[PDB]
């Protein structure tokens, strides 16, 4: 289709331009076309609303850090009601990635390499509520991740190489889901030491194209290791 | 404590 | 006035979240409540609407660096093109209501040739953010109307201001990057450039032990300035 | 190059 090549070019630009809102409205129109994602624009779509939730996420732990560190003063409402206010707009925009991944990306997975992808990018978002949820909402989103982690992890460790990247960015975020979301971090460690020690016991089973990618990956492993050990 | 980037 | 100050106080939360669209409509709000601005509430209102502008600023660059690296016959370049246009009316509304926030409210209201040399320099600075990205008879309006709001506030500033305030120092800064950048004047932008700079390091005995910081700062840019644009 | 801030 000629309006998909040109969405396409329009994300790649507003990419450049660090427009990220610009970039998820293009992505976003690309998958509702229907067809299974490249790798190309399958990395555009996660770049572009990992930025988007990102700006939200780095506003409400501000805010949250102000409001906590304060019921005696009476300002203190607006402050809430300035913070469910970004909770609002970061509500919003995990449940249309959420959707956006349940209704095109999940169903046509061609490989499991990209099922992997399209479910942990599931836990991830789904852990993006867990950090602002509470009640009986919160646990239900708690396991709707788990169970998107779990069963990527399940596939991953059948169809990948302990040094494959996607394999590797799974642990990452299961390991620190079990770090933030569960508080438990002596799992959380075993989770990024087990897929540390078995990636580096296969550094010769891979080369220059694999390299890079795949330690900048064990390098964020071992940083949460030393960070969680302490 | 980082997540992917 | 009560939403007075829970307007300023939503204001420095967006600022702290640095969510600066919602900042800058806190602060649009008080200046349209007619009363002269405080020192504190001023420069919120200008940090809120310099990077509320300054993320269209830097993303027009981007994208006009790509447009002109792209020949003329590339099917790209209509949707390059159109993609510039779409952030410079963003980018032109936004020093629009910036421009008549200043003329029907801070420049009306001044009272003091302080706070006009700090709301003629916004006015010279957002109208050179305009000749920045405005070609044709637009482009010649845009950059008198600059160069007229800056020569005043300069003007005002060299008889009633001392060189080492931060205010005088930022204005000379800003006059002195127009010069380089919208007039393509090299040599008088340094000379503009270091004679505040010059004026600045003889009255510094005049200086006041408050804003000591900025203008430590704003010295430095001068000469960084300077140090770059002469070679 | 660089402008006030």
Partial sequence: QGEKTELIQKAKLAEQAERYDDMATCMKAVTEQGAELSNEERNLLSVAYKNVVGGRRSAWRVISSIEQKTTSDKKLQLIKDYREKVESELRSICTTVLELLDKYLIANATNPESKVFYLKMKGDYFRYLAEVACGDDRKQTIDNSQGAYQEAFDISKKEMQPTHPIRLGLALNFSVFYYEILNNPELACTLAKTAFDEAIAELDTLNEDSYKDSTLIMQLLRDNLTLWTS | ?5
């Fill in chain 2, 1 to 5: 404590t980082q997540s992917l980037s």
